[PDB]
Design a protein around this nucleic acid. Structure first.
Ligand SMILES: [Mg+2]
Lengths: 97, 106, 87, 95, 95, 106, 82, 97
DNA sequence: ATCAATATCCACCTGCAGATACTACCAAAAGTGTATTTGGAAACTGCTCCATCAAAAGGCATGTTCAGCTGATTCAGCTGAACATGCCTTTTGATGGAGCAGTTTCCAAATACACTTTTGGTAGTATCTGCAGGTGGATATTGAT
DNA sequence: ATCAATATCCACCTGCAGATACTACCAAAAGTGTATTTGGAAACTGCTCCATCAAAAGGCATGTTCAGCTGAATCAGCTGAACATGCCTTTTGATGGAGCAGTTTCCAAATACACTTTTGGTAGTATCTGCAGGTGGATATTGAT
């Protein structure tokens, strides 16, 4: 029975996802999260579907760019594994704190 | 009756731009050359991006410029990248880029 | 109107595989198990901030419907300008 | 059935000039439209400020020029400046 | 010679209401003046955008209020809003 | 004749704020209550900072507010700090803060 | 005893700045890196200030020129007008 | 014969400079640098005294905050010594690179 | 532990730089009053597109396995902190002059305004085409041995 | 290096979603033309406040020494990647209906003057004082033994 070594499929996935542009979070689950959060601010709101997609494009591009910063913080620490402390450092330096 | 666009030698609408400067509450008065200069800057910039994006489309064996091509164009160009440094192009993805230490063996 | 379902715990619809994919696009090769909850938390803060301003624009306009434009203006306000939706 | 303006036809004109055999998707066009509106707003705004700072009530091609130098990086600014000067100079002689 | 306006006197008044025995250096006063100018610009700016977004020609206290909500953090917003509403009431019900 | 500031119950000049809104190219028109509202908001934030800066003066055995005290006031307050998160107060210095790992080992 | 102007930003001075920044220990190569960073910072800001000076037809950079340049770089400064 | 250990005076200095607000670069050398840099954009420039001051205050506030981020970057990598790579990471994450 | 060097704290003193109070003044807001313009709420209603739902299509959750990464441990050698003072750079202040800024001037270009032409947007109906997603089928890439 | 599992790369291939095409109209642009107002450039100049420099101040360049920090090496432990497996949830196409948005009517509120009163800024002048440094003396910290 055949096995790729840990790290190999990971690099394959990086090339695959760096090549393409489709949204990476499933649509409906994202749409529910948006509605849940909005509802806690104000009841009986509706959303244009393009409003939800806008938030999705923005959130996905925000998360991708944060993961790149995070990856740099891990590598700075001489690791290859991203950890919460890496995200926290990235957000601190960014001024998100 | 020659348009102010043809008078200035421009594809971009000088009339439209003059109007938007007025309705936009930028100052009491708008000089006559202001929309001419602005419409040319705007035209220049869009030529710059369509040139580069057109190239990315060709490099990709495609005939139609899509959002990925605009993103490749902007991000691969130092100056456009800085000018749109805090902007997100929907459906553009990212540049292929993998950090060195992440590659296998040695 | 008769009844409307309760929305709870939808943050978990942001699955482990979806997050992993996002990290892949950001060039990440190895992911600690604690990253998934941290990311969920980070995304929530991000959405709360944007949705708050978006909804504020909605209410100011006196609409019940959040428009693409409400979101686009909310993003601009926060220095995360978005092209592709009329903005 | 209200009218919605865009820079589409002008973007398309300019597209044909630079790549005669290339098309543009509506989404890419929408992005191109957003880019033009965005740059417009940033230049007009700098111009607005600049005028106020100098106690002027008029936005002239001179304000737009300084705004361009403030807004665009090095080489894009240099070239934008020539294109704008050229269009105004040409425009002045043409009535 | 030309008139140099400032919020200094009004800031000094508010200081005296809040700490009657405390003074303020020139440099600190200049900072306070910058602060007032900065917050003014931020609030008026946002109010401008709101009116424009909604095809309105007037900046009303409704726009100032939404601007404040958009710009101030939670508790700061809450008081600013109530201070503002309070001032508009007193102004209305006064011959 | 009675001033609008006194009418509104404010130290901050409603007339001036009204005037500044008009000549600021913010919109074609300015409502009667808007300058009243805005002046109140401006006065309020001023009081808030002066309150906390007065205290910082007191704590440091002083009666005159200096830029140092304005800095201490702003950065020790979560909300004022966020509002001024991209602002530099000249001659403010910084909060006393050393990372624990840098402390000598007891 | 000729010396570059950037070198006028001395080790002790960069050391003091680091100290106010909470830095305990400083590598030898930091002093040159800091000078480079300061230079890019001043280039970006002065460039914009001078641009404001030229627009106003002056030969003197004013505090306001500088304050406006700082504001547009997203580094608002209080204390010098505006 | 008396000698303080490495880091003792450094700590003492952090405390001293965190207490005060005076500028920490000598005025003259900073002024020359400012004039040198400005000369490349326009010749025969004069400077208001307060113009140079404004630049110094802004430049020192900038460098002080950058050292804070730099220090977090060193500590992230489990060091107590700031290095150019720490400044580099801080600037990249800030979006200055 | 003790012990001495030296940093640090605080109470009191005081000159003066920087804060403040006061008067006479004038240009310039800020306010009051009357004539005029219009922006936008309301009220009605066409009609886009949003919530909602039934069926169809593919990604997610879970457990097992072990490769290899992280974090602990130890250690040597490199590299930066600390150290003392006269050389030499910066700070301080005194003095001519550059240019910023205040003032008046007058016209090129600004707004305004009303009929006159042009055009960019849509809207209805039509044919066109680039490429996504399916396939099979030859060429890598990877990891066991 | 050699063999084999499986990912990868094209090349071609049909349907079709989305793009491009006209024919007709039209409201609102944009242009044109003429009368009416004015912003700001241009020219002269008064006086700040800026560059310069002499004398005074006092921070930093310097080389030595070694404390202690950084990074290399080694390795146990365990976390996280890969993949098999079982199947739930999302995606996708179809349809009554809320509210957005389009048009028009009508008044409360805002602009626009001009005129009447005041206030906030400056400026000359004199007046006042909080506190930065200096002193002096006790007490804490740090580092050596
Ligand atoms: Mg809820």
């Amino acid at each position: 029975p055949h096995r790729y070594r840990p790290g190999t499929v990971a690099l394959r996935e990086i090339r695959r996802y760096q090549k393409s542009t489709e949204l990476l979070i499933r649509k409906l689950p994202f749409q529910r999260l948006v509605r849940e959060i909005a509802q806690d601010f104000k009841t009986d709101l509706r959303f244009q579907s393009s409003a939800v997609m806008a938030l999705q494009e923005a959130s996905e591009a925000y998360l991708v760019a944060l993961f790149e910063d995070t990856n740099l913080c891990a590598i700075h620490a001489k690791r290859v594994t991203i950890m919460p402390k890496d995200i926290q450092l990235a957000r601190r330096i960014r001024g998100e704190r | 009756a020659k348009t102010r666009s043809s008078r200035a030698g421009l594809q971009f609408p000088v009339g439209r731009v003059h109007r938007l400067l007025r309705k936009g509450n930028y100052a009491e008065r708008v000089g006559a050359g202001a929309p001419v200069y602005l419409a040319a800057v705007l035209e220049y910039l869009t030529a710059e991006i369509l040139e580069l994006a057109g190239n990315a489309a060709r490099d990709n064996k495609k005939t139609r410029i899509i959002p990925r091509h605009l993103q490749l164009a902007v991000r691969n160009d130092e100056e456009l990248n800085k000018l749109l440094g805090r902007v997100t192009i929907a459906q553009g993805g990212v540049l292929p880029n993998i950090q060195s230490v992440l590659l296998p063996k040695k | 109107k008769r009844h409307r379902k309760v929305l709870r715990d939808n943050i978990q619809g942001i699955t482990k595989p979806a997050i992993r994919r996002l990290a892949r696009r950001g060039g990440v090769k190895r992911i600690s198990g604690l990253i998934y909850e941290e990311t969920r938390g980070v995304l929530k803060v991000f959405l709360e901030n944007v949705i708050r301003d978006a909804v504020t624009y909605t209410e100011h306009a006196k609409r019940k419907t959040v428009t693409a434009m409400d979101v686009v203006y909310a993003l601009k306000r926060q220095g995360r300008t978005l092209y592709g939706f009329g903005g | 059935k209200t009218r919605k303006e865009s820079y589409a036809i002008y973007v398309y004109k300019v597209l044909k000039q630079v790549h005669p055999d290339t098309g543009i998707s509506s989404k890419a066009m929408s992005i191109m439209n957003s880019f033009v509106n965005d740059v417009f707003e940033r230049i007009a705004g700098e111009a607005s400020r600049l005028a106020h700072y100098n106690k002027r009530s008029t936005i002239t091609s001179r304000e737009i020029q300084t705004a361009v130098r403030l807004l665009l990086p090095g080489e894009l600014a240099k070239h934008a400046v020539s294109e704008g000067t050229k269009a105004v100079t040409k425009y002045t002689s043409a009535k």
